[PDB]
Design a protein around this ligand. Structure first.
Ligand SMILES: CN[C@@H]1CCc2c(ccc(O)c2O)[C@H]1O
Lengths: 236, 52, 286, 332
């Protein structure tokens, strides 16, 4: 009679204490989703920074990244489970403007289509995207060589002009800079149109040699949370 | 390939279907017969209600 | 008696608006579990302070000003004054606490989820109300506030008249505890938050300047600060002055500025409950 | 190409036969039946303690105990009558998409985005067995008995497992989409499953062969549940339509949809008598449908986010909805 009630009350108290202890950790950790073209950028960035979960802590802040495990699925009904993640890390091979995977146009139209699907997804109307343009060096090598022309695969490159407000690398050819900004500007054109200030896209020209990508991810996460807090109030 | 699909369709085709009137009558009869035992359909008194 | 009737109607409208807004926001917080948030606990504390103000000191003060005499006892005069000081101090310090919470939210986003928790919000609210009571009930009820000039002691002796006469030291200390320190803290934290908003806007303009993709921040900060500042600043400056200088401030101006400060309780829910969730809750309730 | 022509001819013959056996819609028979009337449902018990969104739930054989799964990595087992947490199970993988409470009341199984299906022994709380072999995310698992479990995974193939050996006794292939949910018949002989393609299939557990295929829907199917009689089942689609199929007639009988709702159904369950079709929605509220008449009886509202789980007790006394808001509201 009363013994069962007392035992259940004690069990509930112990479980509630354990749940509060678990909350103290869950609320202080950030979940990121590593989603992108599975043929490029997963191995390099994961090493630099069914499912693969890696936890990295920077500046005494606990992050937790999940790799989708490369499940071959044209339709992503498991993406609705990631509607509460802090950010979505998108990795695109900026050097694949000419490769063709039944093959897509360049794998870059495929990357743009994937980014548009993720951006316009109903369950991800708030999640911001951190975008990485991996294999920057190979893109520069391709642009320097005249074997492959960007304007052939990308018709809009002929009419494209480099932005006046830009921060080129200290040592970079103008053609490589134009190509890099073109590849960046396609993704930003996709991102800015659909968004309404809830979520933003953070481009980055990363390279395999660079090892500071963890700091970039940390800064982008900080900006994401700060902008979310600012937009929560009438500010910004 | 398509051989398995066509074989499966052939196996599924050889089946017997009763008239929709009979199935509707069966469902209606089941619903009417077991209507008394449903607590959600007819709310139980607060004395018999465990949660309330 | 046309002027008296008009004043009574105005004060009745003021108290009705204060009570209605406060009860609406309190019941919106209480009814829906989605609205229960660490910031919303501070909002609830401020709403409770404003509700106590509107229920206790606005109607009794209106009756006193219309009757021109205090019908109730001297103990009730002291209790009403103590409740008034409590409400003002608690409301202003809760506004300061909300400002500090927002400063910590924007300034330290990673540490915000650990620096502020549901358990510690109760501790903060209890500390705010304890400070308000210590600066309100302790001097007023133990009779430390009273002055010593002939008019003050004559008013104290007669139970018919209930008016505020206070020492220079207590007036200065109460003003610093209630308004000036929270004013400075709120100004600092809001300047920092505005700087953060400007920096974020500059970063956005850097990332997506070519595409169309700080007027809003200025408007929100002005609504939050100016309404609080314009309501309470004149009252507290004249509160300091009239004990600094004996004949500088007349009684009518003092009461007018005090009631202008009172109106801030009614104005608070409009400022602090414009979120879409609060709007949806209010629409559902009414 | 000849095989494709033969398949098209067989499909045309199937459609012709289903049209031939169609005589009168269920509405024609049920028109004379008096409506259930307005049904008022209010929350009796509210269950709190989940850190993150709730994705699935399952009642027990006794109506007291229910198990819930959340993406926070916890598998909490509640006591409905006393509103108490009997057990709280940590999980190896944070993402879980399903849970099940065995009819014996001893075993609880949960699966998620990781391919591993984990089975927990309540009375002994450790991982009794980790069932591996799928190449996709699991969607729904149910217990045939204390020893056999059937799972639905992201790949097109379902599977019947054996707990003692930890291997797939039989696998149910031949489907063309990611299986999203399945339900067991009142007898353990048969079960059905719906998926991303419009087709919802019927499987025979013992033989392992597919028997029937229903393609009434126009979008993906997220929920499925048999009629209490066991000769019918209703499917919830990613569109606004919820439809009821019949095993004997081998075709759709009635469709439950309204022009005022455009969201997608995420959970479907039947009442004990079968006259109420409680169906969750991507909208924050839940709807109760008169199964025989397709006229809405009541509306279950009170969830701040979309409802992802729904269940009705064996005795039919309680109805619990698990939404993405971390709460389990038990209705009556
Ligand atoms: C009776 N009116 C009182 C008088 C002085 C005073 C008020 C409010 C807050 C304070 O810190 C005060 O010192 C006014 O409401």
């Amino acid at each position: 009679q009363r013994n069962e009630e007392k035992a259940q009350r004690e069990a509930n108290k112990k479980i509630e204490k354990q749940l509060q202890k678990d909350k103290q950790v869950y609320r202080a950790t950030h979940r990121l989703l590593l989603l992108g073209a599975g043929e490029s950028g997963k191995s390099t960035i994961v090493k630099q920074m069914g499912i693969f979960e890696t936890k990295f802590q920077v500046d005494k802040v606990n992050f937790h990244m999940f790799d989708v495990g490369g499940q071959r699925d044209e339709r992503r009904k498991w993406i609705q489970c990631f509607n509460d993640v802090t950010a979505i890390i998108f990795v695109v091979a900026s050097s694949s403007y000419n490769m063709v995977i039944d093959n897509q146009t360049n794998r870059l139209q495929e990357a743009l289509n994937l980014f548009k699907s993720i951006w316009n997804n109903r369950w991800l109307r708030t999640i911001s995207v951190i975008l990485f343009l991996n294999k920057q060096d190979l893109l520069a090598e391709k642009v320097l060589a005249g074997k492959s022309k960007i304007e052939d695969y990308f018709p809009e490159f002929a009419r494209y002009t480099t932005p006046e407000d830009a921060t080129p690398e200290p040592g970079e050819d103008p053609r490589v800079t134009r190509a890099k900004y073109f590849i960046r500007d396609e993704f930003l054109r996709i991102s800015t149109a659909s968004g309404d200030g809830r979520h933003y896209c953070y481009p980055h020209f990363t390279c395999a040699v660079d090892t500071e990508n963890i700091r970039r991810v940390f800064n982008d996460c900080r900006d994401i949370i700060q902008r979310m807090h600012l937009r929560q109030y009438e500010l910004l | 390939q398509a051989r398995k699909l066509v074989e499966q369709l052939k196996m599924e085709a050889n089946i017997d279907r009763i008239k929709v009137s009979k199935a509707a009558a069966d469902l209606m009869a089941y619903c009417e017969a077991h209507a008394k035992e449903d607590p959600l359909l007819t709310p139980v008194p607060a004395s018999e209600n465990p949660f309330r | 008696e046309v002027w008296v009737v008009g004043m009574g109607i105005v004060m009745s409208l003021i108290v009705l608006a204060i009570v209605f807004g406060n009860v609406l926001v309190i019941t919106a917080i209480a009814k829906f579990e989605r609205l229960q948030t660490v910031t919303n606990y501070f909002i609830t504390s401020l709403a409770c302070a404003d509700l106590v103000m509107g229920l206790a000191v606005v109607p009794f003060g209106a009756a006193h000003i219309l009757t021109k005499t205090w019908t109730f006892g001297n103990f009730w005069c002291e209790f009403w004054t103590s409740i008034d000081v409590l409400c003002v101090t608690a409301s202003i310090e809760t506004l300061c606490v909300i400002a500090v919470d927002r400063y910590f939210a924007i300034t330290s986003p990673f540490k915000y989820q650990s620096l502020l928790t549901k358990n510690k919000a109760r501790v903060i609210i209890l500390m705010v109300w304890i400070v308000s009571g210590l600066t309100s009930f302790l001097p007023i009820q133990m009779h430390w506030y009273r002055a010593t000039h002939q008019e003050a002691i004559n008013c104290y002796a007669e139970e018919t008249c209930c008016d505020f006469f206070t020492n220079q030291a207590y007036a200065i200390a109460s003003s610093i505890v209630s308004f000036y320190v929270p004013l400075v803290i709120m100004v600092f934290v809001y300047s920092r938050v505005f700087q953060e908003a400007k920096r974020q806007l500059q970063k956005i303009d850097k990332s997506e300047g070519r595409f169309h993709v700080e007027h809003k921040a200025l408007k929100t900060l002005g609504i939050i600060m100016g309404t609080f500042t314009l309501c309470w600043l004149p009252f507290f400056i004249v509160n300091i002055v009239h004990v600094i200088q004996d004949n500088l401030i007349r009684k009518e101006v003092y009461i007018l500025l005090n009631w202008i400060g009172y109106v801030n309780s009614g104005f608070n829910p409009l400022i602090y409950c414009r979120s879409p969730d609060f709007r949806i809750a209010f629409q559902e309730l009414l | 190409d000849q095989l494709r022509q033969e398949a098209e001819q067989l499909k045309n013959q199937i459609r012709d036969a289903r049209k031939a056996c169609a005589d009168a819609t269920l509405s024609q028979i049920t028109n004379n039946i008096d409506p259930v009337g307005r049904i008022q449902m209010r929350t009796r018990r509210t269950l709190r303690g989940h850190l993150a969104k709730i994705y699935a739930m399952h009642w027990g054989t006794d109506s007291r105990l229910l198990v819930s799964a959340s993406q926070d990595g916890k598998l909490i087992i509640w006591d409905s009558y006393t509103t108490n947490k009997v057990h709280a199970i940590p999980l190896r993988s944070s993402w879980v998409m399903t849970c099940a409470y065995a009819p014996s009341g001893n075993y609880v199984a949960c699966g998620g985005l990781d391919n591993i299906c984990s089975i927990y022994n309540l009375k002994t709380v450790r991982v009794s067995r980790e069932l591996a072999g799928h190449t996709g995310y699991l969607s729904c698992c149910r217990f045939l008995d204390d020893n056999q479990i059937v799972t639905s995974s992201g790949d097109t193939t379902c599977a019947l497992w054996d707990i003692e050996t930890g291997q797939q006794t039989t696998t149910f292939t031949g489907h063309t989409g990611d299986v999203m949910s399945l339900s067991l018949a009142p007898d353990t002989r048969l079960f059905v499953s719906g998926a991303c393609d419009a087709s919802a299939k019927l499987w025979d557990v013992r033989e392992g062969m597919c028997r029937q295929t229903f393609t009434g829907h126009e979008s993906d199917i997220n929920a499925i549940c048999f009629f209490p009689n066991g000769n019918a089942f209703a499917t919830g689609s990613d569109d606004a339509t919820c439809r009821l199929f019949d095993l004997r007639a081998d075709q759709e009988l009635m469709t439950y949809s309204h022009d005022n709702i455009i969201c997608g159904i995420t959970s479907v369950s039947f009442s004990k008598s079968g006259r109420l079709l409680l169906a969750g929605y991507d909208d924050f509220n839940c709807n109760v449908w008169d199964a025989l008449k397709a006229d809405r009886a009541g509306v279950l509202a009170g969830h701040d986010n979309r409802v992802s789980c729904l269940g009705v007790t064996d005795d039919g006394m309680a109805v619990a909805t698990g939404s993405w808001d971390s709460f389990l509201k038990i209705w009556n």
